Amino acid sequence: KMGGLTSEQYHSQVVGKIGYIARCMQTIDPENNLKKIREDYQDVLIWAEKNYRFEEILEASKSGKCPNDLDALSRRSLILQELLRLVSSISPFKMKLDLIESQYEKMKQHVNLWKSDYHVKLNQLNQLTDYLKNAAPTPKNNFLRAMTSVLQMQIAQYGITEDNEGINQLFKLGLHLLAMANEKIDEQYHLFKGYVKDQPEESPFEGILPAEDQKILVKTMIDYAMPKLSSKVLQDKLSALSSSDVLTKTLLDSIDRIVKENEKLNA
Amino acid sequence: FYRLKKIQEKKKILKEKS
Amino acid sequence: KDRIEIFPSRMAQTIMKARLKGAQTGRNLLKKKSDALTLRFRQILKK
Amino acid sequence: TFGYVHGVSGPVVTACDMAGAAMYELVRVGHSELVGEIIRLEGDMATIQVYEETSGVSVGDPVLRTGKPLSVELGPGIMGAIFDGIQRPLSDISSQTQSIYIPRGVNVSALSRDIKWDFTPCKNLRVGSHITGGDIYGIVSENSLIKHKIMLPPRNRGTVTYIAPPGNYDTSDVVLELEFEGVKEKFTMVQVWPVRQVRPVTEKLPANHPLLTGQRVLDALFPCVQGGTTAIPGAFGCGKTVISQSLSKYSNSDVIIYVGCGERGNEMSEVLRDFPELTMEVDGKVESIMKRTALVANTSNMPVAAREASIYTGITLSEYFRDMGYHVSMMADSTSRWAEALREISGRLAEMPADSGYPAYLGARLASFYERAGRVKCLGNPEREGSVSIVGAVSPPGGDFSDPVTSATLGIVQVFWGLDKKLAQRKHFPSVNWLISYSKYMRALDEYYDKHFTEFVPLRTKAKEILQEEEDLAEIVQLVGKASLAETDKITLEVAKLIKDDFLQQNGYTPYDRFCPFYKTVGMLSNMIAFYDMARRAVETTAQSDNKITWSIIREHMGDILYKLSSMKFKDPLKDGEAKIKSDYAQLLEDMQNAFRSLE
Amino acid sequence: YLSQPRLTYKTVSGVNGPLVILDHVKFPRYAEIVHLTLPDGTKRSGQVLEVSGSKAVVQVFEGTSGIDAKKTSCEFTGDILRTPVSEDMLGRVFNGSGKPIDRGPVVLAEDFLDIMGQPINPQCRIYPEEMIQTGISAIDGMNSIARGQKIPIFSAAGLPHNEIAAQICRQAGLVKKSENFAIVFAAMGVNMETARFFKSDFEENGSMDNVCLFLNLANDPTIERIITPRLALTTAEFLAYQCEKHVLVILTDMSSYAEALREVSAAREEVPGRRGFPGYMYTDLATIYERAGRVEGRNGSITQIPILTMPNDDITHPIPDLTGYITEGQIYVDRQLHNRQIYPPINVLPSLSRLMKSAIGEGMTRKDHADVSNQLYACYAIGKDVQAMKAVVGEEALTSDDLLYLEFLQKFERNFIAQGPYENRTVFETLDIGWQLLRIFPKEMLKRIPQSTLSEFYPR
Amino acid sequence: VCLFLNLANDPTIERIITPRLALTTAEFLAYQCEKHVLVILTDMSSYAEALREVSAAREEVPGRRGFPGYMYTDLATIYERAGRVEGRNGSITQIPILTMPNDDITHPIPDLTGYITEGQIYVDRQLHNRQIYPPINVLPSLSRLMKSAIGEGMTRKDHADVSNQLYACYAIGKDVQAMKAVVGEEALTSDDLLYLEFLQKFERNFIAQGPYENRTVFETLDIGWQLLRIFPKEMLKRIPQSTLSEFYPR
């Protein structure tokens, strides 16, 4: 209590932290399935699983029954808080109970969690996620949304703690597209297609994105080449592709094929 | 400064106790 | 010594300020004369 | 309540019938309700120092007791607001009264009770939760940049009895109600805090992260940290606006709080005109810095007890935004104009003077002020961490660092960026002296550098050595004739000038030199010191070999390498990427190495 | 209005110094105004200085001679000092308390304004832009004054700062591009020869219709010297911010104001401050110097020119030192230039205008203003250094470029600075004189003038 | 260790009873439990300034620069609680730490402290600016209990003479260093250069130590003799002859 943590203040803070750990647990696992984790936090979840008032757990802390080392409680709370952050960032997708405990005990053994790079990559992912909560439909917003959904699923399938260079690539690509001026539109198409080319698959949004928006994705990529037209035959050729509901890499290669004959229609 | 403050203090002691 | 023998008063202050200004103008006069002689010296050496 | 006036003699009012009135409480005197503060009690009488003009106050006038000392209101409505040392809403007085003056005894709230704010509660909280002091229990969407976190006051606790659903509320509605030991507390979006009390934290951490400003100097040679304390010289024609403009536009801070502590009348009209014009870029869009900035503005004729309490209003606002999880950087312009109002308030109370007339408690105040900065772990449940960085400005008479205020502030602060006028007259910008400046935060930024920019600290030490050696070789070149110059010294006096002209000199009126990232800075310094190293070894190896190399051969064998060195500071960080500039610098390095092997 | 009858008291309970202590006052109001009637009939005026219960302490303007505690009457006015103000005050001479001393009637009021005034909102003031043309090339051409600045004149005893003030007053105006202007003059603590000079010089040089003169003399009551600049500034604020004129306010010898401040402070039984003057002198000077500037929505300004004499020619005395913390720049009236018989004796090397950059330029004076001023300053300093070296090196061992910096010196001090007390030089005449002086040096020596301007103005 | 931490954002008037709590603890541990205590009181300047503030609060007679007239009699009730007593096997060694305002040693705080304590260790700024550690200037330093603690059977027979000779040589070297700033480098004699060499080697070999280096006193005396051998034994006019006969040639 080096300076301002009076006894009343110290034990009020302890009771508050106990309640916060209880709430974070109830949110991270509403239907009890991480029995290992709900067991590791048992001595602090007991004081909330049965109804004690604020003053009962307060006098329990002053006496000495419940945990009263605010620093130990803080370092045990940061772990569960970052777990909840990881499992609530990837909200539409999900994670199964093996990777959850894997990541949990990978976090439990870190020297300093606030100085880790799981914290840093979670900061980046949450930046991307928060820009898109009330965004306006536009090219760069749609591209960010697509790449963000792909990143969320890749994290839900692999994890955040171990290195997975697809996740790193998508991370830095999204963080470079997010900070790109909303006037540069020739660059924020080159970024999207340069990503799509360096992606082993060719149907990335395979349940990753509902088809109703894959239509908007394929259309948005179809009117970026129409102003650059130079004939009528290629008009029909390009507008024939307008019937695809899957933004496949072959469609983009067909786009850059048709633009070849577009150029060929000049001197 | 100290001498003048002393004179004023003695003034405001006399006038109040008298 | 570390000080000049004088008594503190608002007359000694202006006297001492006058002394300071006079000394640090004489310094500039001598610092100009020395560089004049120095230029002459550097010319004499070359020729 | 409601004492009465018994006597008036100058600014000092005496009030009778004031039985239970605390010391330093605030009161409102008269029928126009001038604001004053209780400075002495005696029986049933109170002695009040009135802030405004007491001309016209008669005997028998009312005296309203407020119940609290000088405090600030903290809630949504602070960003982009303009206050003064008492936290009066200048831009709202100006529009409700439609006059160009500040009325006498004006009583308007600091945060408007008309705006409807978008409030969403914490989704886990429900009736029965255990919430303590500091917990964030809601969020108000203030603007597109700053989320405003609603926190419980640092001294309350209990169980949630009622919490409001998401919706639009003004800063008067009850958004939370909790219970403790049979007593209820209702809490709204605004909390009140005394400005002379430090806000509580969980622990004061050591500061170990840089404060990025964007200038190559002040970021390489004299670094500041997030949570540090800086001091600059506030003088005329020294190029002082670079610091505040850089802090506002290009910095890793989240919130900015600017404070004028008694500035001239027309010097405030320049800040209040320029600051609403600066812009930033966030998420690609361009926004105004007054979406994350608050200003405290005083002039020389405003009350002397507002020109003194300004520093405290500013630091309390920044400690309020630090407790949310943000990183704030406060700036106090002309702390000397605050010390003079301090001395005058002392003088009014007929207090014994100290050295140079300033009060006895001057260093105590100047130290307990700067002890409020730093990085902290915030009180409350959701495990955050914040910081406050203070930048003070002193105005020593004629550049003399012996005034009590300047001596104290240089004894306290850890960084000191010394802006010079001599360099400003030579068109050397930013006009930092680099010879009297210092920074004592260089040993705290050692895990950071060694983890992120491993090959930097040696370059920093080398550059400092070179810039010192070019300077203590001054009489050697004047009292002797420039000829008795060992080749090591020619190499120095040339590369040090290369640094002075193409590293330490930056031009903000460009598209490439407004902001200099740190990868670009370390690249530009590594190429220069690598040149220096190679060109110095090439000479001192062939010291006695009949093939004496001098700077005359080095400057002819590499005539384009030197230009490309002097042209490193044109690589745009936006039109060119980061990998592109890295590869360009690496290519220049390999060309240097080649053209140095094709010389031996 | 005030429709209740006034109260007269015959309850004087003490007399000492300039103070009369009355008892049984009903509800004594602070800073109120009182009219005293002496036992024989002479009428005096006073102001309430302290209030305590049923007791008032009145400070009498004309002293307490012949006042006894049994037949002197004091009638209480019921309010504070409010002065009448109208636009007809332009062209008139009042004394320190505001009553006519020019053989004319009293001011028919357009309003009654409290002379203490309220502070200007820091958020309504805007930045000074255009130029105030004084007609003196040492100020106009090299220390330009912007509309809304506050720039003092520092001088000493015996130096001719009153004639400089009079010339500024009877020449100042606006720049004639390719006039709503007024002046308010406040003379505080002047003797009778100075007051005669001001009055006659203004009213006989055909200019006393855009001037309002407030004359306070050294034998006048010392309380009127406290209210003289506040009447001047109340009138200036009316004119500038309600009638939208451009006002210039000249206040002569603020040092006498400081002395009167010290007197009325010591009358309150307050312990002296640093070097004699009260501890609150900064705030009192600031409530005067800060009643100035441009404001948003009005087309009028207030420019202030305080004038001081430095005691013992010291620049760190409390009055100059504190005036430096509130104002923007300074003009220096020198004594070496006065003894060498140069008028006006203005030293341009220590002088400065902090807002000159805003007052000059294209569309305000001319496109060559800043460069001509910079080059004149540079050449003058260099010529002074050359004249220093000439005394030890000898005039027969000087360069040909050091013989040019010694003709520029004489021509600059005798043709540019030295003007003539009735000679009005517009800004363009000043700049043309500057070019006539700069054409001594070959075009290649004028280093501070860009080549794009050395092409248009040098070949003439 | 027992810490009593009063920080810069804590009550000012409670800085008056902190050193007295520390010293009461020290006296209990030393004169009743018979231990050897070492007391470190940090910034007696802040104590003196809190004392000035409380004195000015109730309008008492000042001394120099506003400090109360009883500041000597108040600092002496703190510094004088340090020593040994007859019959008990404890002690109290006090090491206050000061900060002199503007590096002035004539300020009331250092001036009244030096009249009460048995010496002082002077930390210099001019040596800090040359990156010297520890930056200790030995001329304004003093210890008043040295003469009775050194010598034969205590450290070594020659301690006092080496100390006095190093003092004399250091003072003459600092005189020559200031003469040459006026008369130039090439107007000095053959002995002035000996003094200017002693100055450099002393400041770099004797003073400068390194922050974790523990020199036994015999190593210090050997370094002192290696420094004194710069001069012929006739320039060392403070050392008796029978000491120079035994210690100078080696």
mmCIF file of N, CA and C in Angstrom, chain F residues 143-212:
data_model
loop_
_atom_site.group_PDB
_atom_site.id
_atom_site.type_symbol
_atom_site.label_atom_id
_atom_site.label_comp_id
_atom_site.label_asym_id
_atom_site.label_seq_id
_atom_site.Cartn_x
_atom_site.Cartn_y
_atom_site.Cartn_z
ATOM 1 N N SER F 143 37.087 16.339 7.538
ATOM 2 C CA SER F 143 36.601 15.461 8.592
ATOM 3 C C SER F 143 37.349 15.812 9.865
ATOM 4 N N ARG F 144 36.610 16.135 10.919
ATOM 5 C CA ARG F 144 37.193 16.661 12.142
ATOM 6 C C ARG F 144 37.678 15.581 13.096
ATOM 7 N N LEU F 145 37.382 14.312 12.828
ATOM 8 C CA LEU F 145 37.799 13.212 13.687
ATOM 9 C C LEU F 145 38.858 12.339 13.030
ATOM 10 N N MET F 146 39.532 12.844 12.001
ATOM 11 C CA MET F 146 40.521 12.041 11.296
ATOM 12 C C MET F 146 41.818 11.940 12.079
ATOM 13 N N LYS F 147 42.263 13.049 12.672
ATOM 14 C CA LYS F 147 43.560 13.085 13.340
ATOM 15 C C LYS F 147 43.676 12.039 14.440
ATOM 16 N N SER F 148 42.563 11.642 15.043
ATOM 17 C CA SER F 148 42.579 10.680 16.133
ATOM 18 C C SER F 148 42.286 9.259 15.683
ATOM 19 N N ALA F 149 42.023 9.045 14.397
ATOM 20 C CA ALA F 149 41.636 7.741 13.885
ATOM 21 C C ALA F 149 42.662 7.131 12.947
ATOM 22 N N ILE F 150 43.701 7.872 12.580
ATOM 23 C CA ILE F 150 44.737 7.406 11.675
ATOM 24 C C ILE F 150 46.064 7.409 12.421
ATOM 25 N N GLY F 151 47.022 6.658 11.892
ATOM 26 C CA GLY F 151 48.365 6.659 12.422
ATOM 27 C C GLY F 151 48.827 5.268 12.764
ATOM 28 N N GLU F 152 49.912 5.199 13.529
ATOM 29 C CA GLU F 152 50.525 3.920 13.862
ATOM 30 C C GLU F 152 49.586 3.082 14.717
ATOM 31 N N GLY F 153 49.425 1.816 14.343
ATOM 32 C CA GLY F 153 48.530 0.925 15.040
ATOM 33 C C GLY F 153 47.072 1.099 14.699
ATOM 34 N N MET F 154 46.724 2.121 13.921
ATOM 35 C CA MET F 154 45.348 2.372 13.528
ATOM 36 C C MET F 154 45.144 2.162 12.034
ATOM 37 N N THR F 155 45.869 2.890 11.184
ATOM 38 C CA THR F 155 45.998 2.505 9.783
ATOM 39 C C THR F 155 47.443 2.212 9.400
ATOM 40 N N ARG F 156 48.333 3.199 9.490
ATOM 41 C CA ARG F 156 49.731 3.077 9.093
ATOM 42 C C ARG F 156 50.426 4.385 9.433
ATOM 43 N N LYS F 157 51.736 4.296 9.650
ATOM 44 C CA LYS F 157 52.484 5.390 10.259
ATOM 45 C C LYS F 157 52.470 6.662 9.416
ATOM 46 N N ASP F 158 52.340 6.543 8.096
ATOM 47 C CA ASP F 158 52.557 7.664 7.189
ATOM 48 C C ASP F 158 51.278 8.322 6.690
ATOM 49 N N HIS F 159 50.114 7.914 7.194
ATOM 50 C CA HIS F 159 48.835 8.363 6.646
ATOM 51 C C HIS F 159 48.716 9.885 6.635
ATOM 52 N N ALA F 160 49.005 10.519 7.772
ATOM 53 C CA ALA F 160 48.746 11.948 7.923
ATOM 54 C C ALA F 160 49.640 12.785 7.019
ATOM 55 N N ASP F 161 50.912 12.407 6.892
ATOM 56 C CA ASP F 161 51.838 13.180 6.075
ATOM 57 C C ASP F 161 51.478 13.097 4.600
ATOM 58 N N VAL F 162 51.166 11.896 4.112
ATOM 59 C CA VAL F 162 50.708 11.751 2.736
ATOM 60 C C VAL F 162 49.471 12.599 2.500
ATOM 61 N N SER F 163 48.535 12.599 3.451
ATOM 62 C CA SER F 163 47.316 13.383 3.271
ATOM 63 C C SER F 163 47.620 14.874 3.165
ATOM 64 N N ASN F 164 48.440 15.393 4.081
ATOM 65 C CA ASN F 164 48.751 16.819 4.071
ATOM 66 C C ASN F 164 49.529 17.216 2.824
ATOM 67 N N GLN F 165 50.421 16.344 2.357
ATOM 68 C CA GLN F 165 51.200 16.673 1.173
ATOM 69 C C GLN F 165 50.336 16.647 -0.077
ATOM 70 N N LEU F 166 49.404 15.699 -0.162
ATOM 71 C CA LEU F 166 48.475 15.695 -1.281
ATOM 72 C C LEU F 166 47.623 16.954 -1.286
ATOM 73 N N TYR F 167 47.209 17.421 -0.106
ATOM 74 C CA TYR F 167 46.446 18.666 -0.029
ATOM 75 C C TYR F 167 47.256 19.849 -0.546
ATOM 76 N N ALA F 168 48.497 19.984 -0.074
ATOM 77 C CA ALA F 168 49.333 21.105 -0.500
ATOM 78 C C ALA F 168 49.575 21.076 -2.003
ATOM 79 N N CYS F 169 49.929 19.907 -2.534
ATOM 80 C CA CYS F 169 50.222 19.799 -3.957
ATOM 81 C C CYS F 169 48.987 20.074 -4.803
ATOM 82 N N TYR F 170 47.817 19.600 -4.368
ATOM 83 C CA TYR F 170 46.588 19.854 -5.112
ATOM 84 C C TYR F 170 46.258 21.340 -5.141
ATOM 85 N N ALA F 171 46.446 22.031 -4.016
ATOM 86 C CA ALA F 171 46.169 23.463 -3.995
ATOM 87 C C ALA F 171 47.125 24.235 -4.899
ATOM 88 N N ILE F 172 48.417 23.898 -4.875
ATOM 89 C CA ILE F 172 49.360 24.628 -5.722
ATOM 90 C C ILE F 172 49.108 24.329 -7.194
ATOM 91 N N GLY F 173 48.717 23.095 -7.511
ATOM 92 C CA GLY F 173 48.370 22.779 -8.883
ATOM 93 C C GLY F 173 47.170 23.563 -9.371
ATOM 94 N N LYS F 174 46.152 23.706 -8.523
ATOM 95 C CA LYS F 174 45.004 24.507 -8.923
ATOM 96 C C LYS F 174 45.334 25.989 -9.018
ATOM 97 N N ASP F 175 46.355 26.460 -8.301
ATOM 98 C CA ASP F 175 46.814 27.834 -8.501
ATOM 99 C C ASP F 175 47.491 27.998 -9.860
ATOM 100 N N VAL F 176 48.384 27.068 -10.204
ATOM 101 C CA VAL F 176 49.084 27.138 -11.487
ATOM 102 C C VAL F 176 48.100 27.045 -12.646
ATOM 103 N N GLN F 177 47.072 26.207 -12.499
ATOM 104 C CA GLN F 177 46.099 26.032 -13.571
ATOM 105 C C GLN F 177 45.382 27.332 -13.900
ATOM 106 N N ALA F 178 45.220 28.212 -12.919
ATOM 107 C CA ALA F 178 44.566 29.491 -13.146
ATOM 108 C C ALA F 178 45.544 30.575 -13.548
ATOM 109 N N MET F 179 46.811 30.444 -13.158
ATOM 110 C CA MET F 179 47.817 31.366 -13.678
ATOM 111 C C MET F 179 48.012 31.175 -15.177
ATOM 112 N N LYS F 180 47.994 29.925 -15.643
ATOM 113 C CA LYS F 180 48.241 29.681 -17.058
ATOM 114 C C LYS F 180 47.082 30.126 -17.937
ATOM 115 N N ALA F 181 45.885 30.290 -17.377
ATOM 116 C CA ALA F 181 44.775 30.821 -18.154
ATOM 117 C C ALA F 181 44.936 32.301 -18.459
ATOM 118 N N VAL F 182 45.896 32.967 -17.831
ATOM 119 C CA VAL F 182 46.185 34.373 -18.071
ATOM 120 C C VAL F 182 47.517 34.547 -18.785
ATOM 121 N N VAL F 183 48.558 33.839 -18.329
ATOM 122 C CA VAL F 183 49.893 34.037 -18.888
ATOM 123 C C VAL F 183 50.227 33.049 -19.994
ATOM 124 N N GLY F 184 49.347 32.102 -20.288
ATOM 125 C CA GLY F 184 49.533 31.215 -21.411
ATOM 126 C C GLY F 184 50.309 29.957 -21.070
ATOM 127 N N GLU F 185 50.302 29.028 -22.026
ATOM 128 C CA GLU F 185 50.901 27.716 -21.814
ATOM 129 C C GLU F 185 52.422 27.774 -21.761
ATOM 130 N N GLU F 186 53.038 28.739 -22.441
ATOM 131 C CA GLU F 186 54.481 28.745 -22.639
ATOM 132 C C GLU F 186 55.196 29.765 -21.761
ATOM 133 N N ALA F 187 54.551 30.234 -20.697
ATOM 134 C CA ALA F 187 55.189 31.122 -19.736
ATOM 135 C C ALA F 187 55.402 30.455 -18.386
ATOM 136 N N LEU F 188 55.161 29.154 -18.290
ATOM 137 C CA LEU F 188 55.302 28.425 -17.042
ATOM 138 C C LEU F 188 56.722 27.895 -16.889
ATOM 139 N N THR F 189 57.060 27.527 -15.659
ATOM 140 C CA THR F 189 58.405 27.102 -15.308
ATOM 141 C C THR F 189 58.492 25.583 -15.463
ATOM 142 N N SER F 190 59.591 24.990 -15.000
ATOM 143 C CA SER F 190 59.741 23.543 -15.020
ATOM 144 C C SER F 190 58.977 22.862 -13.896
ATOM 145 N N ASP F 191 58.679 23.584 -12.814
ATOM 146 C CA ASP F 191 57.934 23.039 -11.686
ATOM 147 C C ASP F 191 56.435 23.229 -11.828
ATOM 148 N N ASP F 192 56.007 24.297 -12.500
ATOM 149 C CA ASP F 192 54.589 24.467 -12.772
ATOM 150 C C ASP F 192 54.057 23.333 -13.629
ATOM 151 N N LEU F 193 54.885 22.795 -14.521
ATOM 152 C CA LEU F 193 54.448 21.659 -15.316
ATOM 153 C C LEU F 193 54.403 20.385 -14.486
ATOM 154 N N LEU F 194 55.289 20.259 -13.498
ATOM 155 C CA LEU F 194 55.178 19.164 -12.542
ATOM 156 C C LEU F 194 53.858 19.236 -11.789
ATOM 157 N N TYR F 195 53.456 20.440 -11.391
ATOM 158 C CA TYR F 195 52.186 20.594 -10.690
ATOM 159 C C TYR F 195 51.004 20.301 -11.606
ATOM 160 N N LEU F 196 51.070 20.751 -12.860
ATOM 161 C CA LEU F 196 49.992 20.474 -13.800
ATOM 162 C C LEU F 196 49.912 19.000 -14.177
ATOM 163 N N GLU F 197 51.009 18.256 -14.054
ATOM 164 C CA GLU F 197 50.942 16.812 -14.240
ATOM 165 C C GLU F 197 50.362 16.121 -13.016
ATOM 166 N N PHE F 198 50.783 16.554 -11.826
ATOM 167 C CA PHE F 198 50.195 16.024 -10.604
ATOM 168 C C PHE F 198 48.691 16.216 -10.598
ATOM 169 N N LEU F 199 48.217 17.379 -11.042
ATOM 170 C CA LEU F 199 46.783 17.646 -11.024
ATOM 171 C C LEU F 199 46.020 16.612 -11.842
ATOM 172 N N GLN F 200 46.464 16.372 -13.076
ATOM 173 C CA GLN F 200 45.786 15.419 -13.947
ATOM 174 C C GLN F 200 45.838 14.011 -13.373
ATOM 175 N N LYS F 201 47.030 13.557 -12.982
ATOM 176 C CA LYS F 201 47.145 12.189 -12.489
ATOM 177 C C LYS F 201 46.386 11.990 -11.185
ATOM 178 N N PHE F 202 46.300 13.025 -10.350
ATOM 179 C CA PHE F 202 45.529 12.946 -9.118
ATOM 180 C C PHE F 202 44.046 12.830 -9.414
ATOM 181 N N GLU F 203 43.520 13.731 -10.243
ATOM 182 C CA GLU F 203 42.098 13.700 -10.544
ATOM 183 C C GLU F 203 41.678 12.436 -11.276
ATOM 184 N N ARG F 204 42.588 11.778 -11.997
ATOM 185 C CA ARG F 204 42.195 10.601 -12.762
ATOM 186 C C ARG F 204 42.551 9.273 -12.105
ATOM 187 N N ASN F 205 43.502 9.241 -11.180
ATOM 188 C CA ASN F 205 43.937 7.999 -10.557
ATOM 189 C C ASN F 205 43.516 7.865 -9.108
ATOM 190 N N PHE F 206 43.562 8.952 -8.346
ATOM 191 C CA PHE F 206 43.223 8.913 -6.932
ATOM 192 C C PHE F 206 41.725 9.102 -6.724
ATOM 193 N N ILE F 207 41.179 10.216 -7.209
ATOM 194 C CA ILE F 207 39.763 10.498 -7.001
ATOM 195 C C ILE F 207 38.901 9.489 -7.746
ATOM 196 N N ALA F 208 39.044 9.434 -9.070
ATOM 197 C CA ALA F 208 38.188 8.602 -9.909
ATOM 198 C C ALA F 208 38.321 7.132 -9.543
ATOM 199 N N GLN F 209 37.199 6.490 -9.262
ATOM 200 C CA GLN F 209 37.287 5.174 -8.642
ATOM 201 C C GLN F 209 36.465 4.089 -9.319
ATOM 202 N N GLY F 210 35.260 4.391 -9.773
ATOM 203 C CA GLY F 210 34.378 3.358 -10.264
ATOM 204 C C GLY F 210 33.406 2.906 -9.195
ATOM 205 N N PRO F 211 32.148 2.685 -9.576
ATOM 206 C CA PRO F 211 31.063 2.655 -8.589
ATOM 207 C C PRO F 211 30.907 1.353 -7.823
ATOM 208 N N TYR F 212 31.760 0.354 -8.039
ATOM 209 C CA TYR F 212 31.681 -0.885 -7.272
ATOM 210 C C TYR F 212 33.057 -1.343 -6.818
#
